[PDB]
Design a protein around this ligand. Structure first.
Ligand code: 79Z
Length: 560
């Protein structure tokens, strides 16, 4: 047997009181009236998840797997990465990162306090000197908001001191290596606008395109000890500082391959023998491992002219069709291979012949036209979870604000423009907090963003057309309308009226507030201002953006 986890029987315990019901609040109710549909997960459902994530892994590797691995290693040897200093790693720590068991918190780390730095230095030295002793981890039930119920997701993470050391050893590796190894297939390197262009190009370049998303069942749990050792072998192909090599070796043996699980009450909950969901390498490791397995499976299945796009455990393949029945057979062969590699599917993949019908990372491509009449493709999603979360975050102050990330990531969409932007700029205006920087998440990492910079951020990530899409697709119109009815969200007509008021108030303030009124809410007015490129937009330093943070979220960047 080769189980993802073993358990003692000790419970996964909360760190505080956990709310399950959406609070009834006047502001939140102006967004969403059917509050009974909205719930937050809690530790009370943790045992159901434990059952789901615990299973035997079977893995058999073949020539296709080893051939791709050899190629990946050759490419990794063209990478150089540096150690981060204590201070650099400290400043990548989000302010609400979990505090250390050893007498300090995230703010102490961020302020370079002597206690924090001294402990981090001691942990680093211990990684260099000890390559064997398993490192402790905490296991927690996540508290996440959904519309109706899902059991809580689990997160597994080491102490804050270790997390800072991970950054020192590996931040520059995870930031640099995947592009070199996977090329254009590395999904996190693209902005949303670049991602759509890549997909449309890839689709439209085929004579007869076929595409599918591949859903691996509980990916972290399918990741074997050998997978994690293979990942390390790829990291070690880089040109690294001697201390980096040692710390990576130590982290792999002591933390990444497995270790003990401790609850918030300090009790031994069990042992992990699979991917930790809350370590620095979770996203990069999953991406490399998913790519390796999938690339090998493509060859096993004899798929023709494959284009792969990989974001962690999320995979899309676009290829040349051989005919419907032939494609069905190839997908079965693909699934068989992934299964042999210990990446069995949740829902078996289905061949799709319409690009807009593929869903990956909860998203699909759709089409509109911009102010110039040009056809524009963009990424959208069902707005249910975004709106449910926005309602919760309106009722309750939350440390990380999903609504801001959703505005940024889904800026071109009908629902982000008409509902999210209107709702939150109305509240920020009323509360006089337009200037206040807020923490949000983009690609699972944490960003401090000033709402007043949104026009420039949107232009950089999506292009100028984000501010003028019209003629949304009937499917998209209907999905949005169905969502609003289900959740009890006011009609778009109401949002238009609210936005006109928000826009006028913003324009009156001048400065960036006025830019927000002009660009974000031009859709709301009959007499539309001519929107030209915002010159200051190119000033934003996005060099260090898009490093993936799933599922720990423990990377921080402030927009500069
Ligand atoms: C392998 N899959 C992919 O690369 C992604 C697809 C996708 C690809 C092909 C297809 F046919 C349909 C959809 O949509 C995405 C949306 C996001 N975003 C949000 C995800 O939370 S976003 C809108 O910011 O770009 C991301 C973010 C995580 C990097 C990744 C993807």
């Amino acid at each position: 047997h080769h189980m993802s986890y073993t358990w003692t029987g000790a419970l996964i315990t909360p760190c505080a009181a956990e709310e399950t019901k959406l609070p009834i609040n006047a502001l939140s109710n102006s967004l969403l009236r059917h509050h009974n549909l909205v719930y937050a997960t809690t530790s009370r459902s943790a045992s159901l998840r434990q059952k789901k994530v615990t299973f035997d892994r079977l893995q058999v590797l073949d020539d296709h797997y080893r051939d791709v691995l050899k190629e990946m290693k050759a490419k990794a040897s063209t990478v150089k990465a540096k150690l981060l200093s204590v201070e650099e790693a400290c400043k990548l720590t989000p302010p609400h990162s979990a505090r250390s068991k050893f007498g300090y918190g995230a703010k102490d780390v961020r302020n370079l306090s002597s206690k924090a730095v001294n402990h981090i230095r001691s942990v680093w030295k211990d990684l260099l000197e000890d390559t064997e002793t398993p490192i402790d981890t905490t296991i927690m039930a996540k508290n996440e908001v959904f519309c109706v119920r899902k059991p809580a997701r689990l997160i597994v993470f080491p102490d804050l001191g270790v997390r800072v050391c991970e950054k020192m050893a590996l931040y520059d590796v995870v930031s640099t290596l995947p592009q070199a190894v996977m090329g254009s297939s590395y999904g996190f390197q693209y902005s949303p606008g670049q991602r759509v262009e890549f997909l449309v190009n890839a689709w439209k370049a085929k004579k007869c395109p076929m595409g599918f998303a591949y859903d691996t069942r509980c990916f972290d749990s399918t990741v074997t000890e050998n997978d994690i050792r293979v990942e390390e072998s790829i990291y070690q192909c880089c040109d690294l500082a001697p201390e980096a090599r040692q710390a990576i070796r130590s982290l792999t043996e002591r933390l990444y391959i497995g270790g003990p699980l401790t609850n918030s009450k300090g009790q031994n909950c069990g042992y992990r023998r699979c991917r930790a969901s809350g370590v620095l390498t979770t996203s990069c490791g999953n991406t490399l491992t998913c790519y390796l397995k999938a690339a090998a499976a493509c060859r096993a299945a004899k798929l023709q002219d494959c284009t792969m796009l990989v974001c962690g455990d999320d995979l899309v393949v676009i290829c040349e069709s051989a005919g419907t029945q032939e494609d069905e057979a190839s997908l079965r062969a693909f699934t068989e291979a992934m299964t042999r590699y210990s990446a069995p599917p949740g829902d078996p993949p289905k061949p799709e012949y319409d690009l807009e019908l593929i869903t990956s990372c909860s998203s699909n491509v759709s089409v509109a036209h911009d102010a110039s009449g040009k056809r524009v493709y963009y990424l959208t999603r069902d707005p249910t979870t975004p709106l449910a979360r926005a309602a919760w975050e309106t009722a309750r102050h939350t440390p990380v604000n999903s609504w801001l990330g959703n505005i940024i990531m889904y800026a071109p969409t009908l629902w982000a423009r008409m509902i999210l932007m209107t709702h939150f700029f109305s509240i920020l205006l009323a509360q006089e907090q337009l200037e206040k920087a807020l923490d949000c998440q983009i690609y699972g990492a944490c960003y401090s963003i000033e709402p007043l910079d949104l026009p420039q951020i949107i232009q950089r990530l999506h292009g100028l057309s984000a501010f003028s899409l019209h003629s949304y697709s009937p499917g998209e119109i209907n999905r949005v309308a169905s969502c609003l009815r289900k959740l009890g969200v006011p009609p778009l007509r109401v949002w238009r009226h609210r936005a006109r008021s928000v826009r006028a108030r913003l324009l009156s303030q001048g400065g960036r507030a006025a830019t927000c009124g002009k660009y974000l809410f031009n859709w709301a007015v009959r007499t539309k201002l001519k929107l030209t490129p915002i010159p200051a937009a190119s000033q934003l330093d996005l060099s260090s953006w898009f490093v993936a943070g799933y599922s720990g979220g423990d990377i921080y960047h402030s927009l500069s």
